[PDB]
Design a protein around this ligand. Structure first.
Ligand code: 7OA
Lengths: 99, 99
């Protein structure tokens, strides 16, 4: 749908068989969740943001459903204070900015 | 314009008489610039992001031009890795998400 920005643009997602809420985040290259449990192998990665860097687990080729749309791609797991859907997934569901 | 997300959604802005580039960032509540020089009084603020907290100067009622569109609002100044236009400004220029 269309989403305005008067509130945080939070949507419901399903990932790894679990239900979560996440912020649609055009300022994020990648997608990051806290407190989810994904199957399989992963690789450690350091990512940078406001206030410095944080250690995450990188999982590849993870299916995700984002407000009803299917995507597959890399998901980072680490201590973000809010779950974020980044451009690697947003491009797959046809998300654009408009003004 | 409409902006797709295959690349970072960077736009040109004018703020405090200076020209900068900045990321349209729907995951940002506030607007944050590195190395601009704004006039007048400000107050210290700590903000949180990925990897922790950072100290910023808070300037209020600052005029900004975002991709040709006029807004006025709070601008935070501090050591962000990339300049970010947040929802406090995006709502003023009619920015929405669409998918
Ligand atoms: C984490 C989000 C929930 C918030 N943020 C916005 C995101 O869009 C950032 C933007 C950014 C992009 C960069 F390139 C580098 C950066 F430092 C920052 N994205 C990011 O950190 O991305 C990371 C990771 C994700 O994937 C890749 O892409 C880039 C890298 C990389 C790995 S913010 O900046 O912390 C922010 C902004 C305004 C604001 N106002 C406030 N006000 C009140 C106290 C409520 S709190 C507050 C917080």
């Amino acid at each position: 749908p269309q989403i305005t920005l008067w509130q945080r643009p939070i949507v419901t997602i399903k990932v790894g068989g679990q239900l979560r809420e996440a912020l649609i985040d055009t300022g994020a290259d990648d997608t990051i969740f806290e407190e989810i449990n994904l199957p399989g192998r992963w690789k450690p990665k350091l990512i940078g943001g406001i206030g410095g860097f944080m250690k995450v687990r990188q999982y590849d080729q993870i299916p995700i459903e984002i407000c009803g749309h299917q995507a597959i791609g890399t998901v980072l797991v680490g201590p973000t204070p809010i779950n974020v859907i980044g451009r690697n997934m947003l491009t797959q569901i046809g998300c654009t900015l408009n003004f």
